[PDB]
Amino acid sequence: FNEPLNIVSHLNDDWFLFGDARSDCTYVENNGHPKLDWLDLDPKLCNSGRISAKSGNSLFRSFHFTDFYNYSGEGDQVIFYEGVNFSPSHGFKCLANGDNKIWMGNKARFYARLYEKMAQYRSLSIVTVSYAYGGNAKPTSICKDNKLTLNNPTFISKESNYADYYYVSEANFTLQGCDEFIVPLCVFNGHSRGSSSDPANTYYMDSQMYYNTVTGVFYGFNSTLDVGTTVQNPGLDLTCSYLALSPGNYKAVSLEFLLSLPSKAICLLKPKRFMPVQVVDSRWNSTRQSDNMTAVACQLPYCFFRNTSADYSGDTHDVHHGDLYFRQLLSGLLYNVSCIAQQGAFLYNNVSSIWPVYGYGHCPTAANI
Amino acid sequence: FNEPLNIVSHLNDDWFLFGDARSDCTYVENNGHPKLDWLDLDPKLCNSGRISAKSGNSLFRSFHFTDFYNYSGEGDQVIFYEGVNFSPSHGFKCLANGDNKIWMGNKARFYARLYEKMAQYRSLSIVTVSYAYGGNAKPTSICKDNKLTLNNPTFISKESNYADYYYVSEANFTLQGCDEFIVPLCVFNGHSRGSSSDPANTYYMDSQMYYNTVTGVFYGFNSTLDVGTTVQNPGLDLTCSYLALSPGNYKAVSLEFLLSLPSKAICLLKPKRFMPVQVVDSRWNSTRQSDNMTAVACQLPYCFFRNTSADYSGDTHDVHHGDLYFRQLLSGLLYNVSCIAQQGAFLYNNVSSIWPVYGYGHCPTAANI
Ligand SMILES: *[C@@H]1O[C@H](CO)[C@@H](O[C@@H]2O[C@H](CO)[C@@H](O)[C@H](O)[C@H]2NC(C)=O)[C@H](O)[C@H]1NC(C)=O
Ligand SMILES: *[C@@H]1O[C@H](CO)[C@@H](O[C@@H]2O[C@H](CO)[C@@H](O)[C@H](O)[C@H]2NC(C)=O)[C@H](O)[C@H]1NC(C)=O
Ligand SMILES: CO[C@]1(C(=O)O)C[C@H](NC(C)=O)[C@@H](NC(C)=O)[C@H]([C@H](O)[C@H](O)CO)O1
Ligand SMILES: CO[C@]1(C(=O)O)C[C@H](NC(C)=O)[C@@H](NC(C)=O)[C@H]([C@H](O)[C@H](O)CO)O1
Ligand SMILES: CO[C@]1(C(=O)O)C[C@H](NC(C)=O)[C@@H](NC(C)=O)[C@H]([C@H](O)[C@H](O)CO)O1
Ligand SMILES: CO[C@]1(C(=O)O)C[C@H](NC(C)=O)[C@@H](NC(C)=O)[C@H]([C@H](O)[C@H](O)CO)O1
Ligand SMILES: *[C@@H]1O[C@H](CO)[C@@H](O)[C@H](O)[C@H]1NC(C)=O
Ligand SMILES: *[C@@H]1O[C@H](CO)[C@@H](O)[C@H](O)[C@H]1NC(C)=O
Ligand SMILES: *[C@@H]1O[C@H](CO)[C@@H](O)[C@H](O)[C@H]1NC(C)=O
Ligand SMILES: *[C@@H]1O[C@H](CO)[C@@H](O)[C@H](O)[C@H]1NC(C)=O
Ligand SMILES: *[C@@H]1O[C@H](CO)[C@@H](O)[C@H](O)[C@H]1NC(C)=O
Ligand SMILES: *[C@@H]1O[C@H](CO)[C@@H](O)[C@H](O)[C@H]1NC(C)=O
Ligand SMILES: *[C@@H]1O[C@H](CO)[C@@H](O)[C@H](O)[C@H]1NC(C)=O
Ligand SMILES: *[C@@H]1O[C@H](CO)[C@@H](O)[C@H](O)[C@H]1NC(C)=O
Ligand SMILES: *[C@@H]1O[C@H](CO)[C@@H](O)[C@H](O)[C@H]1NC(C)=O
Ligand SMILES: *[C@@H]1O[C@H](CO)[C@@H](O)[C@H](O)[C@H]1NC(C)=O
Ligand SMILES: *[C@@H]1O[C@H](CO)[C@@H](O)[C@H](O)[C@H]1NC(C)=O
Ligand SMILES: *[C@@H]1O[C@H](CO)[C@@H](O)[C@H](O)[C@H]1NC(C)=O
Ligand SMILES: *[C@@H]1O[C@H](CO)[C@@H](O)[C@H](O)[C@H]1NC(C)=O
Ligand SMILES: *[C@@H]1O[C@H](CO)[C@@H](O)[C@H](O)[C@H]1NC(C)=O
Numbered sequence A, B: 001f002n003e004p005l006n007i008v009s010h011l012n013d014d015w016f017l018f019g020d021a022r023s024d025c026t027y028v029e030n031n032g033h034p035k036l037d038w039l040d041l042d043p044k045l046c047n048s049g050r051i052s053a054k055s056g057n058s059l060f061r062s063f064h065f066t067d068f069y070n071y072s073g074e075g076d077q078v079i080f081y082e083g084v085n086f087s088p089s090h091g092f093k094c095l096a097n098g099d100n101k102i103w104m105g106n107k108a109r110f111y112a113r114l115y116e117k118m119a120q121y122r123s124l125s126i127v128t129v130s131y132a133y134g135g136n137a138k139p140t141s142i143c144k145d146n147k148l149t150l151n152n153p154t155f156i157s158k159e160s161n162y163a164d165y166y167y168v169s170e171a172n173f174t175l176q177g178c179d180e181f182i183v184p185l186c187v188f189n190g191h192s193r194g195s196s197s198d199p200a201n202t203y204y205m206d207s208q209m210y211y212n213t214v215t216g217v218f219y220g221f222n223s224t225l226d227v228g229t230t231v232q233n234p235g236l237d238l239t240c241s242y243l244a245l246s247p248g249n250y251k252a253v254s255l256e257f258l259l260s261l262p263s264k265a266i267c268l269l270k271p272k273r274f275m276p277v278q279v280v281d282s283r284w285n286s287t288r289q290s291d292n293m294t295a296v297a298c299q300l301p302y303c304f305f306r307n308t309s310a311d312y313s314g315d316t317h318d319v320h321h322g323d324l325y326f327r328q329l330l331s332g333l334l335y336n337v338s339c340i341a342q343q344g345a346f347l348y349n350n351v352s353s354i355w356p357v358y359g360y361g362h363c364p365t366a367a368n369i
């Protein structure tokens, strides 16, 4: 009786879900498909006011790239069912001889910070960050490929009067109107190039730091790897850490190569008593390559991870949308449960065959009578 | 039935207590006092092998000062009953016109890091940290008063050939043999002085950073305050942050004033599934001044704080040792409890009048039947 259920759910109506096409009731198509057949989410929840979901997008994608959706929502119990729209299938690298594995590392670090913080705050949104820069140089899109253009962090070009990239540069940015801010601090970790026409032996070791002008605390990232931009010595790409910062005026200081600074932040608002987030595995049908970086990110005590036992097997829309087992996993959002724990959700508050571990809510005992 | 108990306890025999005189069975006195009358700990636990406690000491005191006890112990459920041996009663400042409130801030930040980490590791000890320094200058005891001498971090003197303190200096240190290390990164935040004979208008703005040579990550602290070393402009003292670092070779870089680096670290070993620490309020009889910095440090989800409802009222030894209510609070270490939660310990695993919140162990229900 009352065994843990492999679902995501909620203790009361104070919940919120962040998603992609599989939770996006506003997507439109014109064909002979059944209505809303791309959904894993139950159509009854489309008008709940508790969903922020966009076909083709993810939190990581909107945070870093020009393909932007303003994910926003507030709840005590926060659930995520997204991530797949930045995966190894996309194969993103900043440069021709870059490394998607670095980008998978970035994915894991971003989601780990996000989940940790969303166990402690009710409200999430994505805000623009402005800068003040004393020179005439403008932003440059150093990191992109044929389908995605990175725009966070911003990279400022070299000033015209400088002959090389061995310069110090800086700009200030303001973080205002949120309790905490997640921003990226990144570096090209390796031997960077100014231009293709430069001598083979001239390269740069990118350095970047952010400095709080009031408190005087700074966090920094220097290049240490031997990887580069050529076929002979490949592997250079953009490594990012994700910092949780208090409101204030900040100084971005670059000691070598291009200045970078945040253009977007995750805005965190309204502290709550600690409540773990729930994360649903977000993957393709195995005809495409997926990753487990959200699983790497989802750790105790701040996150509970839920997954099915099968390939993602689309019903009518295509192979990648409308899976029976993910539909059943999400069906727990249709009702309240007594307790949400590591093993799953416990429907009833009284007795179970299994002891809940890391239980939240009104949890049952597994004692006799 | 089975209401939460205001005690510290354990789920099984896999527990450990860090303490001071009130848990130290090895202290000796020669008088007409009853045997072991300074203890709050039950004498039955003196030979348990689960206690690391020293009269006159605390974790913070041994971490920072020459009055050192090698606190060491391992357990799944970790309990702390210490802290009072660095308090406002001691009135410690690095300098004549310093600020004990800065030192209380340091106390809170140290214990917050320690409690957080001891919810995630079984084993704690204090290890020495060595350095490599390319100059001839030796350590100097810049921070002390009439009863305490700070020795962590170490401060290296100016080289003889330098005329002033506007120099860059560095030294490397190795962290080896632990899974993680807590070390202090500190700065004199204000207008520092080279010497009393210097012109009134010459002062220094202390800067310090630690840099991981392999990964290239650095963490830094610059001076920003206007406080100083004189009666006219007082308040300068040593502000410290407490960093959790992985094993490796590190570089301490000082851009101004004296170079500082770790001489001691908290050695963290043996990852465990998340289990909150229990902290007992550590204060004097109110004839002396206490602080609540361990309470500020003890936050959810990593720590449960326990306190009595009375002044600390010593029985026979003196006013500061052997309190009835603290004796009863610690008596929970004599037996196992089913569940340890935010409200207190629940003895039985089946039913209670109260729903456990943030429960660990085999927790009861408050449902009917
Ligand atoms: C991080 O990288 C920067 C940029 O290369 C380093 O700054 C230079 O360091 C070298 C020697 O260490 C000096 O010769 C340069 O004059 C420094 N400044 C500039 C503006 O180039 C910086 O030292 C590195 N950080 C650490 C902690 O080693
Ligand atoms: C932290 O403080 C150090 C030491 O004062 C700063 O280093 C100096 O900065 C000024 C201008 O910002 C330069 O004129 C000096 O030449 C710098 N170097 C040295 C060795 O004095 C450092 O800039 C401060 N950090 C930040 C992020 O502002
Ligand atoms: C090419 O792949 C994507 C896209 O990159 O936008 C992925 C979307 N999937 C998710 C999970 O967000 C997919 N949406 C649906 C309803 O099929 C869309 C959609 O097929 C196209 O925008 C229109 O065909 O395409
Ligand atoms: C496309 O390849 C590269 C190159 O290897 O030359 C990548 C460089 N980026 C890094 C991180 O090493 C890029 N540098 C700048 C400052 O834009 C240069 C540059 O854009 C071009 O060579 C044009 O000068 O191009
Ligand atoms: C002066 O205060 C202290 C000390 O600074 O060491 C505090 C000790 N208290 C704690 C809680 O650790 C106290 N211990 C006992 C058993 O009385 C000792 C002790 O009185 C002296 O070492 C010997 O009298 O003195
Ligand atoms: C005792 O007072 C002070 C002072 O104000 O002169 C404190 C200084 N410390 C700070 C942090 O400002 C100290 N400086 C050094 C480098 O030792 C000097 C110095 O020891 C003496 O003046 C002897 O030169 O003394
Ligand atoms: C996103 O929505 C939030 C909530 O209204 C808002 O504060 C924020 O400025 C928006 N961001 C962008 C980039 O439109
Ligand atoms: C950035 O802030 C610093 C410190 O307050 C200031 O000195 C500097 O002038 C600012 N930068 C710009 C471009 O205004
Ligand atoms: C993610 O996948 C890798 C490679 O298969 C594996 O080593 C790792 O344990 C996985 N992590 C999680 C949390 O599932
Ligand atoms: C989820 O389950 C599928 C099928 O069992 C498996 O391929 C996938 O690796 C699992 N996800 C994670 C993050 O381990
Ligand atoms: C993908 O989805 C289809 C259709 O649901 C399913 O039959 C198949 O098992 C899945 N996997 C692969 C590799 O085709
Ligand atoms: C969930 O509980 C709330 C009260 O906390 C109630 O308003 C709501 O109707 C419940 N939801 C369902 C689907 O029964
Ligand atoms: C709960 O367990 C205790 C200890 O065995 C017992 O005294 C009590 O009767 C039990 N209560 C119920 C409702 O089973
Ligand atoms: C403290 O004890 C531990 C455990 O034996 C040991 O590893 C460490 O080196 C000791 N530290 C000092 C400073 O004696
Ligand atoms: C400290 O390490 C750095 C980087 O590996 C090295 O360049 C430097 O020589 C070392 N310092 C000393 C004093 O050996
Ligand atoms: C500590 O004491 C201060 C001053 O009385 C008070 O403002 C603060 O709330 C206290 N904090 C805790 C956690 O008890
Ligand atoms: C513990 O209780 C005493 C007496 O009620 C009180 O003075 C003290 O401030 C309490 N401790 C904290 C940390 O609040
Ligand atoms: C301190 O301890 C004594 C002796 O136990 C007790 O009577 C008194 O109430 C306590 N407080 C003060 C301020 O003396
Ligand atoms: C606590 O439980 C353990 C078994 O987990 C047992 O060995 C021990 O005797 C118990 N302690 C007491 C004081 O009963
Ligand atoms: C637990 O609660 C459910 C729902 O009311 C009920 O069906 C069941 O009989 C209860 N079990 C016990 C032992 O009270």
Ligand code: NA
Residues within 6 Å of the ligand: A206, A207, A208, A254, A255, A256, A257, A258, A259, A260
């Ligand atoms: Na840079």
Ligand code: NA
Residues within 6 Å of the ligand: B206, B207, B208, B254, B255, B256, B257, B258, B259, B260
């Ligand atoms: Na310094």
Ligand SMILES: [Zn+2]
Residues within 6 Å of the ligand: A029, A033, A034, A037, A038, A316, A317, A318
């Ligand atoms: Zn369709």
Ligand SMILES: [Zn+2]
Residues within 6 Å of the ligand: B029, B033, B034, B037, B038, B316, B317, B318
């Ligand atoms: Zn005595």
